[PDB]
């Protein structure tokens, strides 16, 4: 049973984090914002209205929301304040979010694994795995 896009819908609470600091480092996030992001245990709320995907990132510090249509490039302002060109695709049971800015690129992959949502973030040689459970 391969995942679907609707399977990602829900309120998700962060439970585990590996390599997050090093990823935010590679992005250019200052120490201050890094220790602030790491102390947070966000909610990630995802809604899938057909191929219209909204991802709301909720914390006590900042709330960040983008809404896109699958496969249509859009302008994203990231939680760390980057202006990027982004495309979400659905590949092999995973929501793949590709960001480009300043000739740099990062990929965030969100997939369902064993009832959990696994978030993989790659920038250059820096990788990070976050694990979320369903609220």
Q: Which residues bind a second copy (CB under 8 A)?
A: 47, 49, 52, 54, 56, 62-67, 69, 72, 74-75, 77
Residue 107 binding Cl ion, by CB under 5 A: no
Asked if residues 23 and 80 have their Cβ atoms less than 8 Å apart, the reply is no
Taking the complex as a whole, the smallest distance from the CB of residue 92 to a second copy amounts, in Å, to 26
Q: Is the separation of the CB atoms in 128 and 118 below 8 Å?
A: no
Q: What is the CA radius of gyration of the chain?
A: 14
Structure tokens, 99: 């960001």
User: Which x/- pattern, by CB under 5 A, does the window 66-85 give for Cl ion?
Assistant: x----------x--------
Give the pair of three-digit tokens for residue 78.
């990231």
Residue among 26 and 76 whose Cβ is closer to a second copy: 76
């Amino acid at each position: 049973h391969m995942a679907s896009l609707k399977d990602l819908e829900g309120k998700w609470r962060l439970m585990e984090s590996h390599g997050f600091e090093e990823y935010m480092k590679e992005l250019g996030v200052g120490l201050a914002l890094r220790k602030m992001a790491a102390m947070a245990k966000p909610d990630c709320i995802i809604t899938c209205d057909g191929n219209n995907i909204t991802v709301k990132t909720e914390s006590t510090v900042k709330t960040t929301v983008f809404s896109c249509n699958l496969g249509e490039k859009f302008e994203e302002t990231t939680a760390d304040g980057r202006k990027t060109e982004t495309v979400c695709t659905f590949q092999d049971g995973a929501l793949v979010q590709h960001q480009q800015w300043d000739g740099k690129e990062s990929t965030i992959t969100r997939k369902l694994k064993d009832g959990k949502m696994i978030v993989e973030c790659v920038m250059n040689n820096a990788t990070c795995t976050r694990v979320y459970e369903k609220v």
